[PDB]
Design an enzyme around this catalytic site. Structure first.
Site, PDB file in Angstrom:
ATOM      1  N   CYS A 109       0.844  -1.194   0.000  1.00 38.99           N
ATOM      2  CA  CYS A 109       0.000   0.000   0.000  1.00 38.99           C
ATOM      3  C   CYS A 109       0.874   1.237   0.000  1.00 38.99           C
ATOM      4  O   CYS A 109       1.624   1.467   0.956  1.00 38.99           O
ATOM      5  CB  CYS A 109      -0.936   0.041   1.213  1.00 38.99           C
ATOM      6  SG  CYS A 109      -1.842   1.622   1.391  1.00 38.99           S
ATOM      7  N   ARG A 112       0.283   4.567   2.906  1.00 39.06           N
ATOM      8  CA  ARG A 112       0.414   4.360   4.344  1.00 39.06           C
ATOM      9  C   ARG A 112       0.911   5.572   5.131  1.00 39.06           C
ATOM     10  O   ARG A 112       1.020   5.467   6.359  1.00 39.06           O
ATOM     11  CB  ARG A 112       1.341   3.176   4.601  1.00 39.06           C
ATOM     12  CG  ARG A 112       0.665   1.840   4.321  1.00 39.06           C
ATOM     13  CD  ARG A 112       1.636   0.743   4.568  1.00 39.06           C
ATOM     14  NE  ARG A 112       2.578   0.639   3.453  1.00 39.06           N
ATOM     15  CZ  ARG A 112       3.721  -0.037   3.511  1.00 39.06           C
ATOM     16  NH1 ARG A 112       4.079  -0.644   4.634  1.00 39.06           N
ATOM     17  NH2 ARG A 112       4.512  -0.106   2.440  1.00 39.06           N
ATOM     18  N   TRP A 281      -9.210   6.654  -0.126  1.00 39.36           N
ATOM     19  CA  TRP A 281      -9.555   7.380  -1.337  1.00 39.36           C
ATOM     20  C   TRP A 281      -8.635   6.878  -2.450  1.00 39.36           C
ATOM     21  O   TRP A 281      -7.636   6.209  -2.186  1.00 39.36           O
ATOM     22  CB  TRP A 281      -9.433   8.893  -1.156  1.00 39.36           C
ATOM     23  CG  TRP A 281      -8.104   9.342  -0.638  1.00 39.36           C
ATOM     24  CD1 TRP A 281      -6.962   9.530  -1.362  1.00 39.36           C
ATOM     25  CD2 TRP A 281      -7.789   9.694   0.713  1.00 39.36           C
ATOM     26  NE1 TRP A 281      -5.945   9.968  -0.541  1.00 39.36           N
ATOM     27  CE2 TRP A 281      -6.424  10.071   0.739  1.00 39.36           C
ATOM     28  CE3 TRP A 281      -8.518   9.713   1.907  1.00 39.36           C
ATOM     29  CZ2 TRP A 281      -5.781  10.465   1.910  1.00 39.36           C
ATOM     30  CZ3 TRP A 281      -7.877  10.115   3.069  1.00 39.36           C
ATOM     31  CH2 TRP A 281      -6.525  10.488   3.062  1.00 39.36           C
ATOM     32  N   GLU A 286      -5.520   3.903 -10.319  1.00 37.33           N
ATOM     33  CA  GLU A 286      -6.345   2.741  -9.991  1.00 37.33           C
ATOM     34  C   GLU A 286      -7.570   2.684 -10.880  1.00 37.33           C
ATOM     35  O   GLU A 286      -7.989   1.605 -11.313  1.00 37.33           O
ATOM     36  CB  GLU A 286      -6.770   2.793  -8.525  1.00 37.33           C
ATOM     37  CG  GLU A 286      -5.618   2.669  -7.565  1.00 37.33           C
ATOM     38  CD  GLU A 286      -6.079   2.661  -6.119  1.00 37.33           C
ATOM     39  OE1 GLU A 286      -6.379   1.548  -5.632  1.00 37.33           O
ATOM     40  OE2 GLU A 286      -6.139   3.749  -5.484  1.00 37.33           O
TER      41      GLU A 286
HETATM   42  C1  HEM Z   1      -6.181   6.597   2.232  1.00 36.13           C
HETATM   43  C2  HEM Z   1      -5.775   6.501   0.951  1.00 36.13           C
HETATM   44  C3  HEM Z   1      -5.199   5.200   0.335  1.00 36.13           C
HETATM   45  C4  HEM Z   1      -4.607   5.161  -0.850  1.00 36.13           C
HETATM   46  C5  HEM Z   1      -4.400   6.389  -1.770  1.00 36.13           C
HETATM   47  C6  HEM Z   1      -4.195   3.798  -1.121  1.00 36.13           C
HETATM   48  C7  HEM Z   1      -3.532   3.356  -2.245  1.00 36.13           C
HETATM   49  C8  HEM Z   1      -3.349   2.032  -2.545  1.00 36.13           C
HETATM   50  C9  HEM Z   1      -3.036   1.494  -3.844  1.00 36.13           C
HETATM   51  C10 HEM Z   1      -2.860   2.342  -5.118  1.00 36.13           C
HETATM   52  C11 HEM Z   1      -2.921   0.175  -3.725  1.00 36.13           C
HETATM   53  C12 HEM Z   1      -2.631  -0.795  -4.888  1.00 36.13           C
HETATM   54  C13 HEM Z   1      -4.053  -0.994  -5.414  1.00 36.13           C
HETATM   55  C14 HEM Z   1      -4.120  -1.746  -6.712  1.00 36.13           C
HETATM   56  O1  HEM Z   1      -3.069  -1.897  -7.329  1.00 36.13           O
HETATM   57  O2  HEM Z   1      -5.221  -2.173  -7.141  1.00 36.13           O
HETATM   58  C15 HEM Z   1      -3.180  -0.181  -2.342  1.00 36.13           C
HETATM   59  C16 HEM Z   1      -3.185  -1.437  -1.769  1.00 36.13           C
HETATM   60  C17 HEM Z   1      -3.605  -1.774  -0.488  1.00 36.13           C
HETATM   61  N1  HEM Z   1      -4.032  -0.909   0.512  1.00 36.13           N
HETATM   62 FE1  HEM Z   1      -3.986   1.104   0.382  1.00 36.13          FE
HETATM   63  N2  HEM Z   1      -4.559   3.014  -0.038  1.00 36.13           N
HETATM   64  C18 HEM Z   1      -5.194   3.855   0.874  1.00 36.13           C
HETATM   65  C19 HEM Z   1      -5.749   3.482   2.085  1.00 36.13           C
HETATM   66  C20 HEM Z   1      -5.736   2.234   2.660  1.00 36.13           C
HETATM   67  C21 HEM Z   1      -6.408   1.857   3.889  1.00 36.13           C
HETATM   68  C22 HEM Z   1      -7.256   2.844   4.737  1.00 36.13           C
HETATM   69  C23 HEM Z   1      -6.151   0.556   4.109  1.00 36.13           C
HETATM   70  C24 HEM Z   1      -6.588  -0.357   5.285  1.00 36.13           C
HETATM   71  C25 HEM Z   1      -7.045   0.091   6.470  1.00 36.13           C
HETATM   72  C26 HEM Z   1      -5.310   0.085   3.022  1.00 36.13           C
HETATM   73  C27 HEM Z   1      -4.805  -1.190   2.845  1.00 36.13           C
HETATM   74  C28 HEM Z   1      -4.331  -1.670   1.634  1.00 36.13           C
HETATM   75  C29 HEM Z   1      -4.086  -3.063   1.310  1.00 36.13           C
HETATM   76  C30 HEM Z   1      -4.320  -4.240   2.297  1.00 36.13           C
HETATM   77  C31 HEM Z   1      -3.642  -3.124   0.035  1.00 36.13           C
HETATM   78  C32 HEM Z   1      -3.260  -4.354  -0.843  1.00 36.13           C
HETATM   79  C33 HEM Z   1      -2.443  -5.435  -0.150  1.00 36.13           C
HETATM   80  C34 HEM Z   1      -2.565  -6.757  -0.862  1.00 36.13           C
HETATM   81  O3  HEM Z   1      -3.347  -6.880  -1.849  1.00 36.13           O
HETATM   82  O4  HEM Z   1      -1.860  -7.696  -0.413  1.00 36.13           O
HETATM   83  N3  HEM Z   1      -5.096   1.132   2.151  1.00 36.13           N
HETATM   84  N4  HEM Z   1      -3.428   0.986  -1.660  1.00 36.13           N
HETATM   85  C1  LIG Z   2      -8.141   0.965   1.006  1.00 33.05           C
HETATM   86  C2  LIG Z   2      -7.689   1.131  -0.421  1.00 33.05           C
HETATM   87  C3  LIG Z   2      -7.611   2.386  -1.018  1.00 33.05           C
HETATM   88  C4  LIG Z   2      -7.195   2.464  -2.345  1.00 33.05           C
HETATM   89  N1  LIG Z   2      -7.103   3.657  -2.984  1.00 33.05           N
HETATM   90  N2  LIG Z   2      -6.899   1.332  -3.029  1.00 33.05           N
HETATM   91  C5  LIG Z   2      -6.972   0.110  -2.470  1.00 33.05           C
HETATM   92  C6  LIG Z   2      -6.650  -1.033  -3.203  1.00 33.05           C
HETATM   93  C7  LIG Z   2      -6.723  -2.290  -2.599  1.00 33.05           C
HETATM   94  C8  LIG Z   2      -6.428  -3.562  -3.319  1.00 33.05           C
HETATM   95  C9  LIG Z   2      -5.853  -3.595  -4.581  1.00 33.05           C
HETATM   96  C10 LIG Z   2      -5.615  -4.808  -5.224  1.00 33.05           C
HETATM   97  C11 LIG Z   2      -5.972  -6.001  -4.607  1.00 33.05           C
HETATM   98  O1  LIG Z   2      -5.740  -7.202  -5.226  1.00 33.05           O
HETATM   99  C12 LIG Z   2      -6.681  -7.765  -6.135  1.00 33.05           C
HETATM  100  C13 LIG Z   2      -6.108  -7.729  -7.539  1.00 33.05           C
HETATM  101  C14 LIG Z   2      -6.488  -8.990  -8.292  1.00 33.05           C
HETATM  102  C15 LIG Z   2      -7.453  -8.188  -9.155  1.00 33.05           C
HETATM  103  C16 LIG Z   2      -7.020  -6.916  -8.439  1.00 33.05           C
HETATM  104  C17 LIG Z   2      -6.558  -5.977  -3.354  1.00 33.05           C
HETATM  105  C18 LIG Z   2      -6.960  -7.268  -2.676  1.00 33.05           C
HETATM  106  N3  LIG Z   2      -8.433  -7.342  -2.617  1.00 33.05           N
HETATM  107  C19 LIG Z   2      -6.793  -4.761  -2.720  1.00 33.05           C
HETATM  108  C20 LIG Z   2      -7.123  -2.383  -1.275  1.00 33.05           C
HETATM  109  C21 LIG Z   2      -7.451  -1.246  -0.556  1.00 33.05           C
HETATM  110  C22 LIG Z   2      -7.374   0.001  -1.152  1.00 33.05           C
END
Ligand code: HEM
Ligand SMILES: Cc1cc(N)nc2cc(-c3ccc(OCC4CCC4)c(CN)c3)ccc12
Ligand code: HEM
Ligand SMILES: Cc1cc(N)nc2cc(-c3ccc(OCC4CCC4)c(CN)c3)ccc12
Ligand SMILES: C[C@H](O)[C@H](O)[C@H]1CNc2nc(N)[nH]c(=O)c2N1
Ligand SMILES: C[C@H](O)[C@H](O)[C@H]1CNc2nc(N)[nH]c(=O)c2N1
Ligand SMILES: [Zn+2]
Lengths: 411, 417
Positions: A109, A112, A281, A286
Site C-alpha cells: 500500500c 500508508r 480514497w 487505480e
Molecule cells: C487513504 C488513501 C489510500 C490510498 C491512496 C491507497 C492506495 C493504494 C493502492 C494504489 C494500492 C494498490 C491498489 C491496486 O493496485 O489495485 C493499495 C493497496 C492496499 N491498501 Fe492502500 N490506499 C489507501 C488506504 C488504505 C487503507 C485505509 C487501508 C486499510 C485500512 C489500506 C490497505 C491496503 C491493502 C491491504 C492493500 C493491498 C495489499 C494486498 O493486496 O496484499 N489502504 N493501496
Molecule cells: C483501502 C484502499 C484504497 C485504495 N485507494 N486502493 C486500495 C486497493 C486495494 C487492493 C488492490 C488490489 C488487490 O488485489 C486484487 C487484484 C487482483 C485483481 C485486483 C486488493 C486485494 N483485494 C486490494 C485495497 C485497498 C485500497
C-alpha cells in the site's frame, strides 16, 4: 541477522532496516528462488496464546508500558480466557491499535503515510446480515463525507469454529456489475462477471447497464448470504470528463468515489476477522490505468485513441501510451472538479518516500513491495522507481482469503 | 521442498510450470523471511577459484554442454571430463573448447533474468579474442566488434571474449561501462554538460591524457587493460559510431533541442562466468529498446533530464503534478526516439513489441526448457507498465550458470604499475 541497507539511487539516501528482524511470517522466497512477483505465495487453543502474547507484548511496548502491571494482568487474563473458551476478545484499544498497524504493515500500500488517521468502527456485536447492512451503510456514509473522504474500517465478529464466518461476498462495497453478453463480449465491468451472476442467481433484478451499482451480499454467522441495496444517495459518483477534449464526456464514463475493499481478512493477535471492509480514497491510476485500460477490464483505450485521431496501425506510434495519459488526466480533473478526494501517482509516491523516511527513523524500517508500490504508468518518473525496498511480513496484517462461494454450504 | 512451481498470467489465466529452478546455483539474496527483489545488487582480486572449487563447477558445465548436444555419457563426454580434470590438476585452471565458449556465451544471455530481449539468445555472434595480449589488440578486436554489430544500422548481436582471469593480477578489463558512451563534465558552477551518468569515468579519461572536446555529445575514448597492465586510451574511429538525430513526427521544434543518441548499446563492464572460469572483459551488444533511451537516458533526473524543456515547448501546465505534464512529455520523447531510429533504418524495438516477444519467449522456454528465470522489477518497462503483457505475468527469479555478473569497477582494485 544484520542491519540491511536500502538505497535510493536517485537521491543516494541510504536507510538502515532493523525492523525486518522482528518479522516472523514467511514471504514465499528462498535463498535460491525469489517469488516477489507472485501474487499469492506461501487456529487451535495451543497455537493461539503465543500469537496473542506477541501482539499484547507489542501493544504494551507501543504505549510505553511494557512489563507494567496492566501488561502482566492482560496476559494472565488472555491466557485464562483462551484456557476456558479456546479464544479471547480484544479490548477496544487493542482492536484500534491492531487495525491501524495492519494498514501500517501492508507492504503493498502506497498510501500508508495516512495509517494512524483511521476511523475504526467496532461491529463485533453484530449477529445478522441486516445488522451488517446497517454497519456498512454507516461506514459508507461516514467515509464518503460528501466527497471529503475519510479512511475507515468496520470490523465484524471474528471467526470461531470456521462454520460461522462473517463475510462480505462483494470484493468492494461499491462496484459496477458486469454481464456476459449473448455475442460474447461484456457490458459493464468484466472483473465482476462471476459475482454479478451470483447476485442474479440470488434474486437480484439487474438493470443491465454499463454502471449498475451492485447490491450488497452479506453473510452473518455462517448463514446463507442476503441481498441489500445500498441507498443510492449514499453512493457518490464522478462523471469523467476531460479539461481539453470536449468529446470525452460523450464517452458516458463515470466511476465511484469510495474505494472500499471488503474481501480481505484482518488478523490480530491470532484472531481472524473475515469481514472487515476498509476504505480510503483513490489514486487516479487505480481507475484510469487499471479499471479502464486493463485487457480484462473496461478496455476503452481503443475508443479514446480513435477520438484523438491517433495512428493505431503500429505499436511504435505509442498510441496506447498517449491515450493512457489523457484518460488519467480526465479522471484526476473530474474528481478534483467535483471536490472528491483523489491523489495523483506523483503526489502519492512522493508522500510514500517521505513515509519511508519517517518509519525508518521512528520504527527502524518499513516493509514495502516495489512490484506493487510503483505505479502502473510512468514508473521511472516517480520517486519510488529508484527506491530500493525490503519486503517482509509483519502482524497485525491484512491477508487474502478464498472467495466464499467456493467454501459455503447453502442451507 | 516441492519439485514444481507454478506461475500464472493474471490477464490470460495461462499457468506455466517451472522445473528448471532445480538447477539454480547461487543465492538470490532473499530468504524465507525477506525479499530483496528490488535491491540493485542483493547478493579480493587475487582470491581466485581453487582446484577443489573448480573441479565441480567445470564438471557441471561440461555435463550441461554434452547434454545439450545429446551426447551425455558418451565417450567424447567422458574423455572431455578426464582432459578437463587433468588440466585443473596440473595447471589449476582449464581452457574451453571453441564450441563450449560459444555455447557458454549464448547461455549466459539465455540465463540473464533481467534481459527482456532474450528471444534472440541463440542468434549471438561470438568473437573469440582469447589470443589477445595487449591493449592495442583489444582495440582491434573491439573496433571489429563494433563494425560487425552495427552493420550499417541493421544491428546484429555480438560478444567479444578476451582471456579469462588467471591469478587475478593479470585481468583483461574494459574500463568503459559501455563501448559507446557520451562524456559528462561537471562545471565549476555545479551544472553538468553532457551525460551526468558518466562524469566519474570522464574524469578518469581526462586524467589519463584524453583531450576532451567539452561538448554535449562527445563519444568517450576506450580505456583498455590487457593482462593486468595499466590501461591505455584509444579513440574509436568516428565513422564506426552510428548515431541518430532525434526528431519528432509532428513537433517541428523537437529537432531544435539538438538531441541525438548512438545506435549500438554495448555493455562492457560485466563478467562472464562459464564453468567456473571468469571472463572479466567480455563486451556484448544488441539493439535498443526505445525506453532505454527515451525514458531513462533522457528523462531520469540524474541523466539528460529534458522533461521540463519538452513540456515547456508543448505549452503544458507545469505548476501542478496532477496535470500529468511529465507523463505527456515522456510519451512524446519516446515517440520521437522510435520515429528517429526507424526513419534512419537503425534497429530499435518499442516496449510493446519487446514485451510481447518476451512473453512468447518465456512460454516457449517453459515448454522446451522447463522454465525461464525472469526479474519482473527489470523486465517491466519504465513507462506504461500495466499496458504491456509482462505486468500481469508472474515470474520466478533464480540464478543459472553460465551467467553475466557484476564486478567491481577496475579503478577501485587496479594496482598501478
Ligand atoms: C487513504 C488513501 C489510500 C490510498 C491512496 C491507497 C492506495 C493504494 C493502492 C494504489 C494500492 C494498490 C491498489 C491496486 O493496485 O489495485 C493499495 C493497496 C492496499 N491498501 Fe492502500 N490506499 C489507501 C488506504 C488504505 C487503507 C485505509 C487501508 C486499510 C485500512 C489500506 C490497505 C491496503 C491493502 C491491504 C492493500 C493491498 C495489499 C494486498 O493486496 O496484499 N489502504 N493501496
Ligand atoms: C483501502 C484502499 C484504497 C485504495 N485507494 N486502493 C486500495 C486497493 C486495494 C487492493 C488492490 C488490489 C488487490 O488485489 C486484487 C487484484 C487482483 C485483481 C485486483 C486488493 C486485494 N483485494 C486490494 C485495497 C485497498 C485500497
Ligand atoms: C537483442 C536486443 C536486446 C534487447 C532489446 C535487450 C534489452 C534489454 C533491456 C531493456 C535490459 C534492461 C536494461 C535497463 O533497464 O537498463 C536488458 C538487460 C540485460 N541484457 Fe539485454 N537486450 C538485448 C540484447 C542482449 C544481449 C546480446 C545480451 C548478452 C549477450 C544481453 C544481456 C543482458 C544483461 C546481462 C542485462 C542486465 C543484467 C544486469 O544488469 O544485471 N542483452 N536487456
Ligand atoms: C546488450 C544490451 C542491449 C540492450 N538494449 N540493453 C542492454 C542493457 C544492459 C544493462 C542495463 C542496465 C545495467 O545496469 C545499470 C544500473 C547501474 C546504474 C543503473 C546493466 C549493468 N551494467 C546492463 C546490458 C546489455 C544490454
Ligand atoms: C504479476 C504481477 O505480480 C501482478 O500483475 C501485480 C504486479 N503489480 C501490481 N501492482 C499493483 N499496484 N496492483 C496490481 O494489481 C499489481 N499486479
Ligand atoms: C530501485 C530499483 O530496484 C532500481 O531503480 C531498478 C528498478 N528496475 C529497473 N528496471 C530496469 N529494467 N532497469 C533499471 O535500471 C531498473 N532500476
Ligand atoms: Zn524475493
Amino acid at each position: 541477522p544484520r542491519f540491511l541497507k536500502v538505497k535510493n539511487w536517485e537521491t543516494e539516501v541510504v536507510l538502515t532496516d532493523t525492523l525486518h528482524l522482528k518479522s516472523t511470517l514467511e514471504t514465499g522466497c528462498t535463498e535460491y528462488i525469489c517469488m516477489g512477483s507472485i501474487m499469492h505465495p506461501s487456529a487451535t487453543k495451543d497455537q493461539l496464546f503465543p500469537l496473542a502474547k506477541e501482539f499484547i507484548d507489542q501493544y504494551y511496548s507501543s504505549i510505553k508500558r511494557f512489563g507494567s502491571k496492566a501488561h502482566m494482568e492482560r496476559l494472565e487474563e488472555v491466557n485464562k480466557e483462551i484456557d476456558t473458551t479456546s479464544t479471547y476478545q480484544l479490548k477496544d484499544t487493542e482492536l484500534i491499535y491492531g487495525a491501524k498497524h495492519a494498514w501500517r504493515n501492508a507492504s503493498r500500500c502506497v498510501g500508508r503515510i495516512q495509517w494512524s488517521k483511521l476511523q475504526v468502527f467496532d461491529a463485533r456485536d453484530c449477529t445478522t446480515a441486516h445488522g451488517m447492512f446497517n454497519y456498512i451503510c454507516n461506514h459508507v456514509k461516514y467515509a464518503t463525507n460528501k466527497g471529503n473522504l475519510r479512511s475507515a474500517i468496520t470490523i465484524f465478529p471474528q471467526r470461531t469454529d470456521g462454520k460461522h464466518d462473517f463475510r462480505v461476498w462483494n470484493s468492494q462495497l461499491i462496484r459496477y456489475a458486469g454481464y456476459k453478453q449473448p455475442d460474447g463480449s461484456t457490458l459493464g465491468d468484466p472483473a465482476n462477471v462471476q459475482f454479478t451472476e451470483i447476485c442474479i442467481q440470488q434474486g437480484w433484478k439487474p438493470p443491465r447497464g454499463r454502471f449498475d451499482v451492485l447490491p450488497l451480499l452479506l453473510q452473518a454467522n455462517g448463514n446463507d448470504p442476503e441481498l441489500f441495496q445500498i441507498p443510492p444517495e449514499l453512493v457518490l459518483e464522478v462523471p469523467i470528463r476531460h479539461p481539453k477534449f470536449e468529446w470525452f464526456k460523450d464517452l458516458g464514463l463515470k466511476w465511484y468515489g469510495l474505494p472500499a475493499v471488503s474481501n480481505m481478512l484482518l488478523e490480530i493477535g491470532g484472531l481472524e476477522f473475515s469481514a472487515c471492509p476498509f476504505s480510503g480514497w483513490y489514486m487516479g491510476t487505480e481507475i484510469g490505468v487499471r479499471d479502464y485500460c486493463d485487457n480484462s477490464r473496461y478496455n476503452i483505450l481503443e475508443e479514446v485513441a480513435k477520438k484523438m485521431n491517433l495512428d493505431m496501425r503500429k505499436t511504435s506510434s505509442l498510441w496506447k501510451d498517449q491515450a493512457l495519459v489523457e484518460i488519467n488526466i480526465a479522471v484526476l480533473y473530474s474528481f478534483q472538479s467535483d471536490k472528491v478526494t483523489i491523489v495523483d501517482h506523483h503526489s502519492a509516491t512522493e508522500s510514500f518516500i517521505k513515509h519511508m523516511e519517517n518509519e525508518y527513523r521512528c520504527r527502524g524500517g518499513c516493509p514495502a513491495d516495489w512490484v506493487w508500490i510503483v505505479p502502473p504508468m510512468s514508473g521511472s518518473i516517480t520517486p519510488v522507481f529508484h527506491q530500493e525496498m525490503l519486503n517482509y511480513r509483519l502482524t497485525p496484517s491484512f491477508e487474502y482469503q478464498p472467495d466464499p462461494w467456493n467454501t459455503h454450504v447453502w442451507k
